[PDB]
Amino acid sequence: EEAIKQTLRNKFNYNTRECQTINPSIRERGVSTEPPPSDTICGNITQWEIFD
Amino acid sequence: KAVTDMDINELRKLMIGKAIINSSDMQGDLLQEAQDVIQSGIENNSAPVLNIEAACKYIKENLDKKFGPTWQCIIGEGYAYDVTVQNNTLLFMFYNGNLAVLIFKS
């Protein structure tokens, strides 16, 4: 009765497919964002320097 | 005649719609935009007598909407300042007579 079961499972009564999904490879990256440099400016304005 | 005839009180009276640039750290194209807005802006709310608050209410709001959120603009007869600013964010142009306009983006 054991052989008859093994005899019941065929190649054309139990095919055996393989299937995987396409997985992207993991990757570890660094990104440092530093804003534009900020420069001190000193200006004086007097009535003469405008007129000059 | 010419320069010799011209006195300060004649020069100021002769011409009000003149324009003169001192410093210009900001890029060439962005100046052309701002210069037109501040000149048209001040003359509008110059009113009977020049409200210096009123001028810089208009210029502040205009330059917030036009470019960036934290834009600071001050005008005056005469003053001294040192002001930390970002690169290519600053124009200093004075209007004719006794009007000094500093505009920058912090």
From TrEMBL, chain B:
Source species, domain of life: Eukaryota
GO molecular function: dynein intermediate chain binding
Subunit structure: Consists of at least two heavy chains and a number of intermediate and light chains.
GO BP terms in the entry: microtubule-based process
Cellular compartment(s): Cytoplasm, Cytoskeleton, Cilium axoneme
Main location: cytoplasm
Key words, A-Z: Cell projection, Cilium, Cytoplasm, Cytoskeleton, Dynein, Microtubule, Motor protein
Protein name per Swiss-Prot or TrEMBL: Dynein light chain
Protein task: Force generating protein of respiratory cilia. Produces force towards the minus ends of microtubules. Dynein has ATPase activity.
Family matches, as InterPro entries: DLC_sf, Dynein_light_chain_typ-1/2
One CC-aspect GO term: cytoplasmic dynein complex
Family, similarity comment: Belongs to the dynein light chain family.
CDD domains cross-referenced by the UniProt entry: DLC-like_DNAL4
